[PDB]
């Protein structure tokens, strides 16, 4: 399974929440450093960039060697165009993805979009969005957390505005792994 972390590097997150997010990335990643488990990372704001590709990923396996030059951008939050980046310029076999493997998508964002796009370009990918802010409250405004939802209201969107409020998602995130 070629899983991907898509974290929110927009201004709207407290300068701390950025690092609390990473901790979570590691809560699943390094905890599940077991073989046959590939990952990636794309920080989205007003623009996009692949923090660490697969190529440099399975070279020095550890979430403290792949976040060497991370710089908190803190601009907007192009949530849609972010998902459409993991699709087109991320999961490309060229970088370092295995065909006979399931492409997962771990989106991390307060659930506040700065644009209205469409993810049909990758509607097949295993989505996994995790809230973290304060904005994720009323339905009148906050509803896009349902937009990238897949299966019925279960453990897709909960109170976890701090995904730290959850143990090791190894045997838990393996829903088809």
């Amino acid at each position: 399974v070629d899983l991907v972390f898509l974290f929110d590097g927009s201004m709207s997150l407290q300068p701390d929440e950025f690092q609390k997010i990473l901790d979570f990335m590691k809560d699943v990643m390094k905890k599940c450093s077991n073989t046959s488990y590939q990952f990636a990372a794309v920080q989205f704001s007003t623009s996009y960039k692949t923090e660490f590709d697969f190529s440099d990923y399975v070279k020095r396996k550890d979430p403290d060697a792949l976040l060497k030059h991370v710089k908190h951008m803190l601009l907007l939050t192009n949530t849609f165009g972010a998902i459409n980046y993991v699709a087109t310029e991320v999961f490309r076999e060229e970088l370092g993805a295995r065909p006979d493997a399931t492409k997962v998508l771990i989106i991390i964002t307060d659930g506040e979009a700065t644009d209205s796009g469409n993810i049909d370009a990758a509607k097949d990918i295993i989505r996994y969005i995790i809230g973290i802010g304060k904005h994720f409250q009323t339905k009148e405004s906050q509803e896009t957390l349902h937009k990238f939802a897949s299966k019925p209201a279960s453990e897709f969107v909960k109170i976890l505005d701090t995904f730290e409020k959850l143990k090791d998602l190894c045997t838990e995130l393996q829903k088809k792994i």
Binding site: M11, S12, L13, T46, L76, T77, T114, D115
Partner: protein, 184 residues
């Protein structure tokens, strides 16, 4: 083609501000503000103009009004400045009595205060300026070795802070410190 106002602001912690994310488009597909601060939107009247209320701002924040216009998404940035009077300005305790002709040290420390490029500190034996220097670090270390001669016979030394927001319509925010009962 975005825009926002006010472009600059100076305010105390917990204070609140209003911001108008405006825009000039035939028909914009989206308008919003980008901040870590608590947002609360205002009136419904209008279409290409939106007002909010950034509340409980403690750090110098900088909101960002965006807009997805057909032409494209643009951005208008405002700057929120927070200013505040320090926790304590008190100076370091020495005992009341002292031998004349002693190159003793007067140390004063201030903890907090912003904007820090406007906050100055001054040690002084009464209404006489002994040393005016800008608050450095946390707490702000400041020192001047005072002597004991003629103006020293039973004096009162003290430490004050002066935060000048006068260059921007506010007042001079200063705080005096507990006196130094020197005897001899």
């Amino acid at each position: 083609q975005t825009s926002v106002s006010p472009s600059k602001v100076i305010l105390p912690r917990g204070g609140s501000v209003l911001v108008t994310c405006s825009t000039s488009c035939d028909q914009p597909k989206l308008l919003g503000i980008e901040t870590p601060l608590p947002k609360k939107e205002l009136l419904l009247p209008g279409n290409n103009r939106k007002v909010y209320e950034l509340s409980n701002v403690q750090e110098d924040s900088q909101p960002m009004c965006y807009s997805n216009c057909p032409d494209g998404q643009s951005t208008a940035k405002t700057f929120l400045t927070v200013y505040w009077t320090p926790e304590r300005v008190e100076l370091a305790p020495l005992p009341s009595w002292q031998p004349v002709g002693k190159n003793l040290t007067l140390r004063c420390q201030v903890e907090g205060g912003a904007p820090r490029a406007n906050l100055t500190v001054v040690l002084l034996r009464g209404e006489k300026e002994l040393k005016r220097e800008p608050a450095v670090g946390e707490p702000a270390e400041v020192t001047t070795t005072v002597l004991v001669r003629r103006d020293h016979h039973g004096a009162n030394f003290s430490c004050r802070t002066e935060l000048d927001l006068r260059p921007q319509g506010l007042e001079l925010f200063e705080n005096t410190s507990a006196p130094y009962q020197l005897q001899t």
